[model samples]
Target: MTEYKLVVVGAGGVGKSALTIQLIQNHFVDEYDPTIEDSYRKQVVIDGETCLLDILDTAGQEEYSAMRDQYMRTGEGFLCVFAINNTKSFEDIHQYIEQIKRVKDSDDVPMVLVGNKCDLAARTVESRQAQDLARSYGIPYIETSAKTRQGVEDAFYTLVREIRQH
Candidate 1:
C-alpha cells in the first residue's frame, strides 16, 4: 500500500487538530488543546486503491516556529487551513504555502487550501476571495467544518490526489 504523509497547518485557533481528530476518530473536539505536534495513521481506500495516510497535526503558535521546516521537509502533501471568520488566519495561509514550496524546492508541491469553521456565521473571508487565491496558485480550495464534518474528507482526499498528480 502507498503511504501519504500529510500535514495540517494554520493559525493556532483555526482547528487544525479538530479536523485531524474528526477524520481519524470520527468525532469533533470542542476544546482547544494548544497542540505542539501530533501524528496519526489510518488505512483506507482512495480512488480504488488501499492507502495509508500519515497525518501530522501541527501547532500554529509562533513558539513552535522552530519545528516548521522539519515537518515541511517530510510532508508529501499539506492542508493549508484557515478559519473563515478570522481574516488574520487567512492571511497567514500564504506564508505556509510559500514555506512548503521553499522547503520542497518545487513550485508545484501538493497542497490544498482549506477554509475551516464554515459553521460560523461571522465570516471575515469571503468564499470568492479564497477561490481566487486558489485559482492563482493553481490549487483546489475546500470549505469545512469539523463540528458538522462538512467537506472534511474532500479536503484531505484532494490533497492526496494532488500528491498523486505531482
Candidate 2:
C-alpha cells in the first residue's frame, strides 16, 4: 500500500463538490450551492491496494481562499476544476493557484484541468478552453460528468498516476 493526498478546487458552482461527490459516492445532484464551505474525506484504492492518505475537497467559492491554500500546500496532486457552462469559472482557474502551490512545488505537482458539467453543453458558455488552460498550466485536462459519471474516474486516475510518478 502507498499514500497520497489530493485537493479539488474551483469557483462557485463549478462542480467541485459534484465531482467530489461522484468520486466518493458515485452519484450526482440537481441542486448545489457554493454559498457555504463544503468538504469530504475518503480513502481510496487502486488495483485492490489501499491508498496512503485522503482526498480533500475545497468549497467552490472564493471566500474560502485561505482554507483552500492550506490544503494545496500539502497536496501531491490537484484537480483544478472549471465548468464548461461558465467561462468565468474557466478564467478564474489561476486565481485558485495564486494563493498556494501544490506539494510538488517545483513544477512537479501534476494538475488536471476538469471541464465539468458536460451534461449541460447545449448551453455551453465557453469553447474548449480547458484544454488550452491545461497547456498554459502545463498539466493534463479532461471534460467530465458528475451526473453520468463520465470521465469522472479518468480525471482522478490521471492524478493518481501522476503522483505515483512523482
Candidate 3:
C-alpha cells in the first residue's frame, strides 16, 4: 500500500478539522479550537488498494506561520479549504497555493480548493466564483458540508485521485 501525505491549510474556523475528522471518523462536531498542529493517520481504500492517509491539520492562527512551510514541504497534495460564509477565508486560498508552490518548488503540485460549510444559506462566496477561481488555476473545486457530510468524500477523494495521477 502506498502512503500519501496531505496537508489541510486554511483560515481558522473554516471547518478544516471538522471535514477531516468527519472523513477519518465519519462523524461531525460543532466546534473545534486547535491551538497547535495535529496529524491524523488513517487506513483508507483508494482505487481498491488499501493506502495510508497521513493528514496534517494545520493551525490557522498566525503563530503557526513558521510551521506552514514545513507542512507544505512534506505534503504530496494539499487541501486549500475555506468557508463559504467568509469571503476573507476564500481570499487566502491563493496565498496557500502560492505557498505550496514556493515550498515544493513546483507549480505542478496536486491540490484541491475546497469550499466547506455548504449547509448554510448565508454563504458569502458564491459557488461559481470559487469554481472560476479554481478553473484559472487548473485545479478541481469541491464544496462540502461537514455538518451534513455532503461532498466531503468527493473533496478528499478527488485530491487523492489527483495525487495518484501526478
Candidate 4:
C-alpha cells in the first residue's frame, strides 16, 4: 500500500485539528486545546485501493510558525482549511497556500480548499467565494463540518486523489 502524507493548514481556531480528529477518531473535539502539532495514521480504501493516510494536523497559532517549513517540505498533499463563520480565517488561507507553494518550489502541488464549520448557522464566508478562490488555484473546494462529519472523507479522499494524479 502507498502512503500519502497529508497536511492540514489554517488560521488559529479554524478547527484544523477538529476536522482531522473527526476523520481519524470518528468523533468531534468539543474543546479547543490550541494544537502545537499532531499526527495520525489510518489505513483505508480510497477509489478501491487500500492506502495509508499519514495525516499531519498542524498548529494554526502564530507561535508555531517555525515548524511550518519542515512539514511543507515533506507533505505530499494539503488541506487548506478555514472556518465559514470567521472571515479572517478565510482570508488567511491564501498565506498558507503561498507558503506551501514556496516551500515546495512548485506551482502545481496537490491541495484542496476546505471551508470548515458548515454546521454553524452564522456563516461569514459564502460558498461562491470559496469556490472562486479554489478555482483561482485550480484546486477542489469542499465544505466540511467536523461536528457532523460532513465532507470530512471527501476532503481527505480528494486530496489523496489529487496527489495520485499529480
Candidate 5:
C-alpha cells in the first residue's frame, strides 16, 4: 500500500469531521453537529487507486496543541480546511504554514486549500478571495460542502492528485 498522509487542520466548527466522514463514508448531515467523537483517523481511495490516506484530524482546542504538533510531524501533503463562513479561518493559514515548516522536511510540499461548507455560501465570509489566497500560496483551492455532498470528495481527491503528479 502506498502511504499518503493528509493533515486536516483549521479552526473548529468548520466541516473538518463532516468532510472526513463524507470522503471516508460518502455523505453527512445538514445540521453539522461537531465533536471529538470522530476524532481518531480514517482513509479513502482515489480514481479506484488504493491510496492509504492516513488523516490526522486536529482539534480546534488550544489544549490539543501537542497533538497538532505530532500530527504535523508526519505528512507530505495538507488539506488546510477553513470555513468559508469565517474570515479568520483564512487568516489562520500562516500559523499552519509555520507549523508545517517546523514539522515538514520539505519547503514546497503538495497542498490544497479547502474552503469548506460551500452549501452555506449565503453565509460565506470569504468570496473568491480564497482562490486568490491559494494562488498566493502557490497551490490549488476548492470549495466543498459535506451537507449537499458538493466538492468534498473532489477536495481530498485533488490533494491526492497533486501528490501523484508530484
Candidate 6:
C-alpha cells in the first residue's frame, strides 16, 4: 500500500493530540497530556487510492522553535494546528509553516492550517483570519473541534488529497 506521513503541530495547549486522537481513534480525552510524541497508523483510501497513513502527534515543544526541524523533515504532509481561543497559538502557527518549508526546501510542500477547539464559545482567532492565512500560503484551512468531532475527518482527507496531488 502507498504510505504517507502526517505530523500534527502547534503551541502547547492547542489540542494537537486531541485532534490526532479524534482523527485516528475517533475519541477525545478531557485533559491535555502534553504528547512528547506519538505515532499511529491506519489503512485507508482517499479518492479511491488506498494507502497506509502514518500520523504523528507531536509535542508542543515546537513552540520553543529549536526542536521542530526534525518534525518538519519527516512528514509528507503537516497539520499546523492552533486553538481558536488562544490568539497566540494561532499566531505561532506561522513558525511551524515556515520551518516546514525551509526544512523541506519546497514552497509547495503539502500542508493544512487547522484551527482546533472550535467547540469552545470563547474565541480569539476567527475563521476568516485562518482562511486568509491559508490562502496566502496556498494551503487548505479547516476548523475542527475534537471534543465534538467537527470537521475532523475532512481535515485529514483534505491533507491526504493535497499530498497525493503534490
Q: Stretches of candidate 5 above 4 Å error?
A: 29-45
Each candidate structure's count of clashing pairs:
0, 1, 0, 0, 0, 0
In candidate 2, what are the lDDT values of residues 1-166, reduced to their tens digit?
6866777888888887888788888778669666354456666777676775457767776666656656777777788888888878876877765444543356656678888888884545454556666777678878898999999989987888778876
lDDT of 3 at 7: 87
Per-candidate local distance difference test? 0.94, 0.74, 0.90, 0.95, 0.74, 0.88
Evaluation by lDDT, superior candidate among 1 and 4: 4
Q: Show pairs that collide, candidate 3.
A: none
Among all windows of 10 consecutive residues in model 4, the one with the lowest summed lDDT is 30-39
Badly placed stretches (over 4 Å) of model 4 are: none
lDDT (Cα, tens digit) per residue for candidate 1, span 1-166: 9999999998888989999999989999998789999999999899999999999999999999999999999999999999999999999998889888888898888999999999999999999999998998899999999999999999999999999888
RMSD of each: 0.7, 2.5, 0.9, 0.6, 2.5, 1.4
Model 4 per-residue lDDT tens digits across residues 30-131: 998998988999999999999999999999999999999999998999999999999999889989999999999998999999999999999999999999
lDDT for model 3:
0.90
TM-score of each: 0.98, 0.85, 0.97, 0.98, 0.84, 0.94
Which ranges in model 2 have alpha carbons more than 4 Å from their true place?
33-43, 47-49, 102-105, 123-127
Ranking by TM-score: 4, 1, 3, 6, 2, 5
Q: What is the alpha-carbon lDDT of model 5 when measured against the actual structure?
A: 0.74
lDDT of 3 at 111: 93
lDDT of 3 at 162: 88
**Model 6 error, position 80 (Å):** 0.7
Clashing pairs in 4: none
Tally clashing residue pairs in candidate 2: 1
lDDT tens string, model 6, 1-166? 7898988888898988888888788889888677778899999888787899899888886444565778788889998999999999988899778878989899999999999999998999999999999999999999999999999989988998889888
Clashing pairs in 6: none
lDDT of 4 at 105: 94
